[PDB]
Amino acid sequence: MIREERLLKVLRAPHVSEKASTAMEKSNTIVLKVAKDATKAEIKAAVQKLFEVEVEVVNTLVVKGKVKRHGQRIGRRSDWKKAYVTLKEGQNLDFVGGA
Amino acid sequence: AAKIRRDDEVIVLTGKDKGKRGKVKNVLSSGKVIVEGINLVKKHQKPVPALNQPGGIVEKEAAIQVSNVAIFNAATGKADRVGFRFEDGKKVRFFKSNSETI
Amino acid sequence: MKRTFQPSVLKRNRSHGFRARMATKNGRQVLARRRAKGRARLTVSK
Amino acid sequence: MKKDIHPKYEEITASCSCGNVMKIRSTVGHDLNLDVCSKCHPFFTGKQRDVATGGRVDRFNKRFNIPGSK
RNA sequence: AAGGUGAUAUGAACCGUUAUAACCGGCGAUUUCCGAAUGGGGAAACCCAGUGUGUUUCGACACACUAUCAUUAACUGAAUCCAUAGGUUAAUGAGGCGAACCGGGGGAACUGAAACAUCUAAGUACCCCGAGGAAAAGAAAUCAACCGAGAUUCCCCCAGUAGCGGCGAGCGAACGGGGAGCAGCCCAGAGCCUGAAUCAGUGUGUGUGUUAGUGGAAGCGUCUGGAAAGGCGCGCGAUACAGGGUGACAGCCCCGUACACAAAAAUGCACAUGCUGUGAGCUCGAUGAGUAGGGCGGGACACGUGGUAUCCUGUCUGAAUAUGGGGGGACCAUCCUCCAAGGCUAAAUACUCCUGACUGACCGAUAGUGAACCAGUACCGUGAGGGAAAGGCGAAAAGAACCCCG
RNA sequence: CGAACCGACUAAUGUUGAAAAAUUAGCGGAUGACUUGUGGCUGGGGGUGAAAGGCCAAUCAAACCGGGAGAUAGCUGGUUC
RNA sequence: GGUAUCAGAAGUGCGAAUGCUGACAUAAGUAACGAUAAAGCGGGUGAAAAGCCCGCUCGCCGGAAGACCAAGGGUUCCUGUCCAACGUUAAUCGGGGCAGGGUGAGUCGACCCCUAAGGCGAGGCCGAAAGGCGUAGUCGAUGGGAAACAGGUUAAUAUUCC
RNA sequence: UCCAGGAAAAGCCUCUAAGCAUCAGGUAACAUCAAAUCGUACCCCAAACCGACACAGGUGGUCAGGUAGAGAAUACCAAGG
C-alpha cells in the first residue's frame, strides 16, 4: 500500500469518556488518543489494517491540558488529539475485548 | 564498599542491642542493613483508605550504619580487610585477618 | 480613561520584542547579554 | 576611502586653533577614474593623488598586478 | 560488581548474584523542531515548493539535495570579430557562538586646575574589527663616547631624578647597573652539486600526563549514660595521627590514609619515525624610490613648537644609490656607530568561562555569590531592564495505631 | 436644531476618592480643518507640534534602561567601650 | 562544644544619620464594606441560611443592565466534590481548591493565491568599522479571489455531530 | 449632480509567442476519487480584556419587537438579563 508513512502507531488508547456508548446511533465511532500528528487519512487507514473495521469518516481535534504543579509554583500543560472516526453498522465489535 | 552480601551473618556493634546475633540483612550498595537484631516495636496507621485499613505495628527495620560486628567467625569483628586472588573473575572476596578466604 | 497599554500580539514583533531581535547588531546583542549573562528562562515570544 | 593603488587615509585628528580645539578632522585624498591600459582597455580605478603619481614611475600594469593578485 | 530500575514518594511490574543486571571510563549508533539556520517565506520551535529515492494494495510517506559569498575547474557567453561582462555546474572553504588577556580602527564627560578656555581626567569609559593560546615585539639605518655594549620581552634599580607644564595643577624619561630568558634566519638568483638540514600537515611508535580503577595497616575490657569514639586498665599499627563518617570527642568500626600497582581504547606535550610539500650546501652575485629628505596641517615621542632632535603621517613635492646613505636632541665641521625603505621567529611576560588536587589568624542564613532551598525563579516593566523573600524535628520516622470533644 | 459619536465652558461632590482627573446636573461640535478600527513611518539635543515648551507609555527647559560611577558636594546629617 | 595564660590580628563595642531589613505597637474595635434598581414570605439542604437551590410575590434594565463577534484573555466552560486561604460579612455558594469531563468542518476563519502603507533586499551605489540606500525580487491586510442551508441533539460542541 | 475629480495585484474572460504538430491540451455532460493542516470551550461595553481590586472609568463592529413619538430622544413594556 502506500503504508509508507507511519501507519505503525498513528492510533492508540481508547477514551471510555462520557461520550462513550452515548455516541452510538447508526454507527459506533471511536475516540482514540491518536498521536498529536496523525492527520485524518492516516487515521482512516490505521483502523483499516488493524481493528479490521470499515471506517466511513474521521474528524479529530486537539484538547489541551494545563495545570500548575511544582516544587513551589510553575506547572504546565500536556496536550493531546481526540479522534471520533465513524465506522458503519453491519459490523459490530465482533470478536474483541471491549474496555 | 560494603561487600557484606545477603545471608551474611553479622553481629551487632556500636550500641543499643549489641552483642546480638542477626544474619542475612538486606544491605545494598549505598543502601540499608536490616540484619535481624535491630528493631523496636513501631506502628502503621490505616494509610489505605479502603476496606483493608490495616496497620503494621509489628516488625520493621532499624537501619544503623554498616559499621556492625564484621561477619565474625570465632569471636567477633575480625575485619575482612584483605583481598584474595586468582579466584573467581568478577570478585575474589577474602576474609578476617585470622585465616584466608571463607 | 485610556490607560497607556492596549495589547496586540501581531504588534509585538518587528515593531517590538519577539524574534525581530535577530536583525540588528544591538538586537542580537540583547539576546547574549540577556540569556548568557545571568541565564534567563526568558520568554519574549508567546 | 580608496586610492586603491596606495592605502588611503581617513584617519582622524584634532584640529587645534589658537591653543586648542578638541574637535576632530578626517576624510582626505580624492578620486578619479578611467585609466587606459596598454592592453585591452580601461577599468576605472578610483585612485587619488600619491596614487595617480604612483602609476607613473611605476607602470599601469604592476600598478594593477596587485589589485588582482592579492 | 552483588545488587539494581536518576530525584522529590513509595508502590507496581520487574532485571540481576560467575563472568554482559546494574554502575564508572573510552570509541561509536541514534539525535524531532527552532536557532549562523543554509530550498523560499515567517510574529523563533510554524507555513509552502522544486528536483531525485526506496517499500509501494505501487496516488503516497517521509527521506535526500537545492542559501550567500570567495578560490579554482570546465562548460556556456552581450552590446562589438575577437575578448571580456554575465550565466551554469562542481570540489573545497567561510558564516555563528565565545569570560578574560592581546593587536588594531573610532573615542567621551563628570573630575581636577579650590572659577575656566591651554592643560586634566585618559587614550580611561565605551563601541567596532581581528587573532592566538598567548598575542605583540624581535636580530640595529640601536646605543655609547674615542672604552665599549650588542634582537624583542618581563622583574628590581637609576628617580619622583632629567626634563615637560596657564613652568599652574600636574605629566614624568633615559644612559647606565642587578636579573628572568636566551637562537637567530629567509626572498630580493643563477650555476654546480643536487630530494641533504629546517619547518608544516598527516599514519605510527616510545616516554610521560588526562580520561574508569586496585591493594592498603593495628583494640579488647570494664564505668556512666538512650546511645561510647569519652573515663580507667592494659594492648598493638604507624613511609598511614589529612580529613570525613558512625546514636557524646575514634590511629586500631567504615571511607579513606603513606606507600605500591594498574589502560581496549581515546587524546596533551615531548622525542622518534614514514608520507607529502619545503629546501640544505658551495661558488659568484644581487642589496628593498614616489622611498629618504622637504613645504603646509596634525598626531606620537615624559617633551604643551619651544632653540626641539627623532617616529607616523592627511596634503603637495622629491635625491644619492656603498670612495654612498642614516644617526649621535636646533645647526656646522671632525670623529665614532649603523645600513632604513621586504618577511618569518621559541622563551622568559598576560588572562580565566573551565579542569583536578590542595590551602585559608575568609563568612557562617540581614553574613558569604543576587541565588546554601526548582533563583536570574516569583514578582515588576511595552520593552531594554530591574530583581526577591526563603536553612535546621530526631540517632532512628520510631512522623503519633487506637480512644474522646468536634 | 438635535441623539449616537467627538469634545470639555460652569457648579456641587469627591480630595486616606468608586476614580493617580471621575461622578451628577447643565455645556460646545455633530457632512466635517469631522470621527474611529487595524497596521505602518518619524528616536532624544532627536522626533512631532493650528505653538502650550505642548506630546514622545501616570516621566519632558532635553525620555527610559545600563554603563563611566563610589561623578563632584568648601553643604546638611550621623559617627558606637 | 569552649578555652586560664602571655602574645598576635581585627568586618572590634550604636541611640539617633526623614539610617537599611524584619517583627510588633498607636490611632481603634474607630472609618469603611464600591453607585439610593431597596426587597417580603414559605419550603429544601445543612452544624448553622438575610445572601445557596425550589416556589409565589415585588422592584430594575430593555439602542439595553439583552444577544452575537472581533481585540485581548488562556480553562474562567460543564459535572462532582471540599470551604483553610480567596470572596471587603455568613457561606452549604463562586470566575476559589482537587478531581474528572468538554470544544468533531471540502463549504465559517487561518493557512493559501493577490497585492497597499511599509519592510526586507542577489548583484549594485555609498560609508573609518558598525552600517545607510536600493534594482530584480521577496514579505506585508486593515483590502480583492470558490463553495451550505433548515430542523434536531449534548451536562457542556454545532453553517463542524444526525 | 458636484469639485476637492476619487488603491493596487491576482483570480476571471480573451488574444496571440516560443513550443506542440493523427498527440498533448481546450470546452461541456456526467462517473468517481480528493479537498490536507491549524482554530473552534467560556468572558467579550466586562467579575475572564486595559486600569494593582469581584475598581461607579476605557474598549471596535453586528442585531434592532409593542404603545406613544419627528426619532437609534424619552417613558412604560416584549424576548431576555
Swiss-Prot record, chain C:
**Which keywords label this protein?**
Ribonucleoprotein, Ribosomal protein
In Pfam terms, one family for this protein is Ribosomal_L34
Return the GO cellular component terms, semicolon-separated.
ribonucleoprotein complex; ribosome
Q: Which domain of life is it from?
A: Bacteria
Q: Which GO terms describe its biological process?
A: translation
**Quick check: keyword Ribonucleoprotein in the entry?**
yes
Q: Which InterPro entries match?
A: Ribosomal_bL34 (IPR000271), Ribosomal_bL34_CS (IPR020939)
Q: Which GO terms describe its molecular function?
A: structural constituent of ribosome
Q: Which family does it belong to?
A: Belongs to the bacterial ribosomal protein bL34 family.
- By its UniProt entry, which HAMAP family does this protein fall under? Ribosomal_bL34 (MF_00391)
Q: What is this protein called?
A: Large ribosomal subunit protein bL34
Species of origin: Escherichia coli O45:K1 (strain S88 / ExPEC)
Q: Supply the gene name.
A: rpmH
